[PDB]
Amino acid sequence: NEGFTVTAEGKGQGTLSVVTMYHAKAKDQLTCNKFDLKVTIKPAPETAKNTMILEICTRYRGDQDATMSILDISMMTGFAPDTDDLKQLANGVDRYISKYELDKAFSDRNTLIIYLDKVSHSEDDCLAFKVHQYFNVEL
Amino acid sequence: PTEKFYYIYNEKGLEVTITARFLYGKKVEGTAFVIFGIQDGEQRISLPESLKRIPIEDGSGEVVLSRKVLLDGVQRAEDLVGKSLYVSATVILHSGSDMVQAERSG
Amino acid sequence: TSLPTSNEYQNEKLANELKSLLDELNVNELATGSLNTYYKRTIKISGQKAMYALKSKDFKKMSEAKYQLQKIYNEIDEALKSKY
């Protein structure tokens, strides 16, 4: 970026347009904007594994109820979603979990996908399911 | 689409097949999001009431656009004659790792 | 006691799944008495492969035999529906 001088000469009429391209400073503008998301992890009411509870709350920052969205979930290495709880959230309207994801057994389901038919823009649509520990590991 | 066109007086409607396979040939397992719409020269009119979410087993999927929804998309069937329909699919693996957007227009 | 570990789970699960099929082995093996010789020949061979794999507790052989024994079962199930 320099400060220079231009010198024209002769007959005729022309136009001179100079434009710069750079990386401006974004004031840490909301990198999410359009999807508020609060994830909480709490222990379960005893009655001594670890089985905890995963609660997910989200809201669309738009004027209209966002259409069909997706919930991409990644478990904590050594945790599998409760099968029974998945059936509950699946049978419920406005939510969908492919049969392919269902019968994966406790063995292998570290990655979960919960398809949503809609997400409110006024309040928060929250859901929760149980998770158990089958694979002990430090850190 | 089963037919390289659409018959206005076709009760069945516009049948479309969603085929998804890995680059190495192997079949793909996932879920697809398919939508429709009408085109007019350069302008496109999306059909929100045609949005479907069909599973993709054996690397194949089946979606249908009922004539009912098509006509309801506008406000004279013989009028739509000449226009074109475009399909916009979006497949997502059951792993949620990759995502591809396809489209058939004309 | 707390929990299993790396090879502590998957190696046990496969063992249980392989055992479940081995329990009803005599059931399927005796079901070929009315079927063809093919089914009787395939199940008597795929039978040992599942047993030898179980005692060895080898993840590879157990899995290799799980589907070996699972396939023949399904082929028998379909072989019966043509007979009612």
CATH number (domain holding residue A83): 2.60.40.690
A40: Cβ contacts below 8 Å, ≥ 6 apart: A54, A55, A57
Which amino acid would we find at residue A89? L
Binary contact (B51, A113; C-beta < 8 A): no
Interface test with B, best of A74, A93, A98 (most B CBs within 10 A): A98
Which of B51, B53, B94 is the closest to A101 by Cβ? Answer: B94
Nearest CB to A136 within list C5, C10, C13: C5
From first CA to last CA, the distance across chain B in angstroms is 11
B15: domain CATH number is 2.60.40.1940
- What is the residue range of B105's domain? 1-106
What is the third-level CATH fold of C1-84?
Substrate Binding Domain Of Dnak; Chain:A; Domain 2 (1.20.1270)
Experimental method: X-ray
User: What's the Cα-to-Cα distance from A61 to each of A110, A114, B10, rounded to whole Å?
Assistant: 29, 20, 41
∠ at Cα A121 (A120, A124), nearest 5°? 60
Question: What Å resolution does this PDB entry report?
Answer: 3.9
The number of domains in chain B is: 1
Note whether B92 contacts A68, CB cutoff 8 Å. no
* Contact predicate A74/A134, CB 8 Å: no
d(CA A35, CA B60): 32
Q: How far apart are CA B55 and CA A98, in angstroms?
A: 7
**Domain around A83:** 31-139
Is there a contact between A135 and C2 if contact means CB atoms under 8 Å apart?
Answer: no
Q: Which helix (H) or strand (E) holds A53?
A: strand A52-59
Phi and psi angles of residue A69, each rounded to the nearest 5 degrees, phi first: -115, 180
